[PDB]
Amino acid sequence: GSSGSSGTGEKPYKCNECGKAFSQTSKLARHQRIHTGEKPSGPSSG
Ligand SMILES: [Zn+2]
């Protein structure tokens, strides 16, 4: 019913690039890696 699981709390460590909310900082970074253009891109995603 609801788009994804997004409860309440503190998600200030969200990706300022795309806008993804993670549980912790370590998670955010591990993701921001896809923004540095280092990893091998695949499908079309903004
Ligand atoms: Zn991002």
Side-chain angles (χ1 to χ4, degrees), residues 6-16 19-24:
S6 309
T8 70
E10 311 196 322
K11 32 57 77 85
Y13 302 78
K14 77 90 90 151
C15 203
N16 270 51
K20 206 297 206 52
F22 317 73
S23 310
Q24 58 193 305

Side-chain angles (χ1 to χ4, degrees), residues 5-38:
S5 60
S6 309
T8 70
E10 311 196 322
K11 32 57 77 85
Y13 302 78
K14 77 90 90 151
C15 203
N16 270 51
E17 296 209 51
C18 58
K20 206 297 206 52
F22 317 73
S23 310
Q24 58 193 305
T25 310
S26 72
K27 292 289 283 275
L28 157 78
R30 202 83 71 199
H31 157 104
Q32 292 181 138
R33 321 310 277 282
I34 93 307
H35 278 308
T36 181
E38 168 160 81

